[model samples]
Target: GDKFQLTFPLRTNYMYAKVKKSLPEMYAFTVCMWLKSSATPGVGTPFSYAVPGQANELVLIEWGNNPMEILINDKVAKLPFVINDGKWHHICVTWTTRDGVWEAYQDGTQGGSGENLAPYHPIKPQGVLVLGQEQDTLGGGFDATQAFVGELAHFNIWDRKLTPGEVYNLATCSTKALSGNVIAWAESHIEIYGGATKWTFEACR
Candidate 1:
């Protein structure tokens, strides 16, 4: 499949990628991205929020008055070791069926770790995908309140859980080095709302 790209202006709330198709329920998977935020306090939703139901699974980067947080389901797994002080940072999250473990990383180091109450299936395809903001209503209806304001790049998703070494490789190395099993990507010119721009796999290389 070809790589996808989205670039748009920045917003104030959550920006998400809606699953266009349902993926097989896997035992594990990895989500990774690069982001740069402004000094202002804003809420950036799960760059890969896939909720199949009320008890579904999702991962997101939440920023408020407090330090930036990396949230996985109901657990406040780990917080970013470095500040989002308007600088670009690479963030990645990994989950696996073995022991239902959840891990978060910033730059190239581990940031936090925790365990999920239950194993989660991949998010089912349902609504229109929004890139720079969260869309609850179908057909691209966005809530600007949760839009993301900043720059995002090198967004990539995998269908299998990645090891710590694999995550490190992805954070620092190249995506083309991996086999062709990428689920979704935003390489270049990902436009959301009007300001936020995201780069998918192709744009990275």
Candidate 2:
């Protein structure tokens, strides 16, 4: 039950609590967010979820370049779409062990897709979950060059791969009839430290 608001002109990294308890059961899940860029490339590390020292753990990374990447077992899947065009778009990535697949969607459409080189292992405890910027090294050692500039909102972490319609509803914030195990969410502006901000969302439950 948390709420986050991100308005333009703020460029610092942000993160939610570590999802240590639910790491193992996260075999299948969806990551969705709304982003509006500032025409500036390489802004900030918008989001990241991974297990410490586990190189092959699943990760959904929103790089400063505005492109979203799915890293499964240390191998990057082939994605055909890039979200760095400086426009507001809903992006989602899903992975499931049922078929060992990796999928990406943009604006409710399947933008890119690929298969994982190796099957991703279930995340274990001690995993570090971060958002807005990288947290590998503390002391605010943020690489400004890779900071993100824009507004981020309606981030949802589901415990299952959402169907296309479910994704669409979530992206548009029409959670009226939605039902699933969601891990985290935030509404409004979640502040970042570098420079830009703009955001919208209902609330994180």
Candidate 3:
């Protein structure tokens, strides 16, 4: 598919992609996406792992403080800190448990740091990943109050943490040796369920 923005309309709409193969065991990982959030503090939903809802599930979160935040297990890492007042933003979250720290980057600069997720763990070998809806249980949580409403694009996941300089170039669409791009926008699968819907906007490589 051509490059496009995935739009979620705050109506409990969400995208779910099942891990299609053996997820790589790892000491590091990264999740990056370009987003323009319309949901406020009470409704800023994002992505997740193993169907989310797991007390220990790792999720990229937003809102609070009007905190346009990313919860790297609670760095409460604000995403570039703009109060999520509604504008496109770039967020890159990477963690290298080998170093025992996780970082969040907003736009092209570092956002915040934290240490809550178990330093070195592999992607759980089972379950699906969800976007837009917050999972309250494995594959079964749908709270309209916390649903994401806005444009989301260029989502990418890596099996390892990114280098310090990779964030900037990536936000601009770099082709440098990005070998760990395990699940990228163009390569992802989307399923519309329970009357959920989305629109495609903008295009790219």
Candidate that scores best on TM-score? 3
Ranking of all candidate structures by their lDDT, best first? 3, 2, 1
Per-model C-alpha lDDT, please? 0.53, 0.55, 0.60
Q: Against the hidden true structure, what lDDT does model 2 obtain? A: 0.55
Winning model by lDDT = 3
Q: On residues 1-205, what C-alpha lDDT tens digit does candidate 2 reach at each position?
A: 3334454444544323233223445677777777666544543555554555653355555564455556665656655555667766777888776656767888788766666534555434344454554444422334444445555665667777888887777656674525335545532223333333333344422
Model 3: per-residue Cα lDDT over 1-29, one tens digit each: 52666666545534433334323445678
Task: Single out the weakest 10-residue window by summed lDDT for candidate 2.
Answer: 14-23
- Superposed on all Cα atoms, the candidates' RMSDs to the truth, in angstroms, are 4.5, 4.8, 3.6
Worst 10 residues of 3 by lDDT: 13-22
Which is superior by TM-score, 1 or 2? Answer: 2
The regions of model 3 sitting more than 4 angstroms off are 11-22, 51-56, 63-80, 175-180, 194-198, 203-205
Determine which window of 10 residues in candidate 1 has minimal summed lDDT. 186-195
Model 2: residues with Cα > 4 Å off, grouped in runs: 1-4, 7-24, 55-58, 62-67, 137-141, 175-180, 187-205
Model 2 misses residue 86 by how many Å?
A: 3.4
For candidate 2, the per-residue lDDT at 2 reads 32
